[PDB]
Structures are given as structure tokens and as C-alpha cells.
């Protein structure tokens, strides 16, 4: 019920029939999920199915105005985590955050929007730290940006590969 949005995606990205897998094409471009969140704590996972050394992803959360024809984290509307070097991006500013991630990894994506906000990334069940705090108010959508022909699969829940031990949340699938 919660899926990659067909109406809200860069045309060059290749979306699977089940709308849970996406393949990138050349320069960065983005797709958002069909549902977003404004309040409370929420979670989803992305698995990197394939990612050769020349490809890359920036994954995280975007409001509706985030530019689909640019990397996630490019403008004020999104916050992202780069596979290459584990850099965090927002308004096109890259900052050190964690170690990088790649093919085979299962990344977790936590947000908390009390109404104090926080974005936390996970790698294979391991909390990589609070990336951003007190973020721009608005509705946030799970988001995927890809560079070149890598492939990733998103899971909105309710069944996660590495359900975090250290905090409470609802699966994004609760919105569907």
C-alpha cells in the first residue's frame, strides 16, 4: 500500500513492477514514496541490491518540493546519506557523518517529528548517529536518489531485516 510513487519520480529512473525496486540512470535523479509523515517517529529500510564502484546513492527523506532532477540533499527540502564515504547532505553541503555503505548493506532510516526533531541512519542494525536535528517543518517522504546504474529496494515495513533495538517508531507501512 505504501510504494514508490509513479506520479512523483524522475522519468529516467527504472521502477520495478512491484514499485519497490529502482535502478538509476546517469546523473543523479530521485523518486519519492507515495506516502509521507509530519508527526511522530517513523522507519523504513533500503537494501542495496547492486552498486558497482562507479555508481552511488543518496538516500533519506524529502518534502514534496525536493528537486527530482538532483541528488537527495541538494536543496532545503531534503536530507540524505551518501553510499560513497557515508557523507551526509543538506542544501548541497556534504559533512562527515559515518563510514560508507554499499552493495549488500541494509540501511535503516529513522525520523522523529515531535510537535526536538531528528534524522538517524542505520547500517545493518547499527545506529550510525544522529545526522540532523531540528529540521525544516513539513511533511517528509522516504526518498531515493541514484547515480548511474545501481539498484536498490525499499521496504516500508512492517517486517524489517534489522529492526532497531534502541528506539521506538512505527513502520512507514502504517501510513498505507
Amino acid at each position: 500500500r505504501v510504494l514508490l510513487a509513479l506520479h512523483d519520480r524522475a522519468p529516467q529512473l527504472k521502477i520495478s513492477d512491484d514499485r519497490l525496486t529502482v535502478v538509476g540512470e546517469k546523473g543523479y535523479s530521485m523518486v519519492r514514496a507515495s506516502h509521507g509523515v509530519r508527526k511522530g517517529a517513523w522507519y523504513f529500510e533500503i537494501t542495496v541490491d547492486e552498486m558497482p564502484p562507479d555508481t552511488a546513492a543518496r538516500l533519506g527523506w524529502s518534502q514534496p518540493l525536493g528537486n527530482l532532477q538532483a541528488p537527495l540533499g541538494y536543496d532545503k527540502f531534503s536530507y540524505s546519506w551518501r553510499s560513497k564515504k557515508g557523507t551526509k547532505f543538506h542544501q548541497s553541503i556534504g559533512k562527515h557523518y559515518s563510514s560508507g555503505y554499499g552493495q549488500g548493506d541494509v540501511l535503516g532510516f529513522y525520523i522523529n517529528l515531535p510537535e526536538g526533531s531528528e534524522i538517524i541512519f542505520y547500517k545493518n542494525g547499527v545506529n550510525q548517529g544522529v545526522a540532523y536535528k531540528d529540521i525544516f517543518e513539513g511533511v517528509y517522504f522516504p526518498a531515493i536518489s541514484l547515480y548511474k546504474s545501481c539498484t536498490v529496494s525499499i521496504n516500508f515495513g512492517p517486517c524489517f531485516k534489522y529492526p532497531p533495538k534502541d528506539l521506538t517508531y512505527r513502520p512507514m507501512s502504517d501510513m498505507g
Binding site: 546517469k26 546523473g27 543523479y28 552511488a56 541538494y74 542544501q91 548541497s92 553541503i93
Partner: peptide
Amino acid sequence: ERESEFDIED
């Protein structure tokens, strides 16, 4: 296009 094409420099 480069991976870092959009990124602001330090």
C-alpha cells in the same frame, strides 16, 4: 556527469 556535480565546495 560527475557524482559530486551538484555539491558546494569547502
